[PDB]
Amino acid sequence: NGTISNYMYFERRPDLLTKGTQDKAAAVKLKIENFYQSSVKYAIERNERRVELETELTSHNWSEERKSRQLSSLGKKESQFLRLRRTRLS
């Protein structure tokens, strides 16, 4: 129709939810919150390592091709970290 706002009210009842589903729902809450809090943490450190290496390399007046090889050497080891974290049997 048009841009009109809609609000709805719910019974909000976790009753008659077959026990296990109630317990399973609590597990995903913990897992999702831990996942996204750690996901931001991983990305922050990944960027902090790169930027700190970049500013460090311009500090020594290195050739651009030499900095890229050093930065690409970090990315390889960063890529090794991702493959390692992907290996799982949980």
């Binding site: 019974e11 939810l17 729902a25 919150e33």
Partner: protein, 183 residues
């Protein structure tokens, strides 16, 4: 039987940001390793997310108007999701496409199967949002499920792994998320 996720339940917690930092390819990191880790992560969390609503997904197969089908060449909503989840698990643990040894690289098929793995996850996203979303609201999980979909969709746009057309059943939700669903 469609359900309305466009109500005030368009509240997403756990999404202070717009997912740009955790989706964007990390600079100098191999592009294959980045996709391979996130796809496995999405499958692991989606399989567990479906596990809480699996009790109440019995015959009634997909959403309104658009009805997905695993039956053609050579099922109820519980059947096609259970087969798709098991299938993704086989491909995601398939050392052919997802090698765990250090020297081995991803094959040429890798890019296409990732496209095949993502769409099934979106189709599994469809039935839960369309038919089993009001139990998510009972369990106070709309905060986590909304942010999980916005992260998943932001990942789809960023690397263009999913066609715009394919998102038709959940397109109104994606448009509503424009502030949290990446631009």
């Amino acid at each position: 039987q469609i359900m309305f996720l466009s109500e005030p339940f368009v509240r997403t917690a756990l999404v202070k940001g717009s997912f740009k930092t955790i989706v964007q390819l990390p600079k100098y990191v191999d592009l294959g390793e980045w996709i391979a880790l996130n796809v496995f992560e999405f499958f692991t969390n989606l399989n567990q997310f479906y596990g809480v609503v699996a009790e109440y997904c019995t015959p009634d197969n997909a959403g309104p108007h658009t009805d997905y089908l695993w039956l053609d060449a050579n099922l109820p909503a519980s059947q096609y999701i259970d087969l798709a989840l098991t299938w993704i698990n086989n491909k995601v643990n398939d050392k052919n496409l997802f090698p765990t040894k250090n020297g081995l690289p991803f094959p040429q098929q890798f890019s296409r199967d990732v496209q095949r793995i993502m769409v099934q996850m979106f189709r599994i996203f469809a039935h839960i949002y369309h038919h089993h979303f009001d139990k998510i609201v009972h369990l106070s999980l709309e905060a986590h499920w909304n942010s999980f979909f916005s992260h998943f969709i932001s990942f789809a746009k960023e690397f263009k792994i999913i066609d715009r057309k394919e998102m038709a059943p959940l397109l109104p939700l994606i448009e509503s998320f424009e502030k949290q669903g990446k631009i």
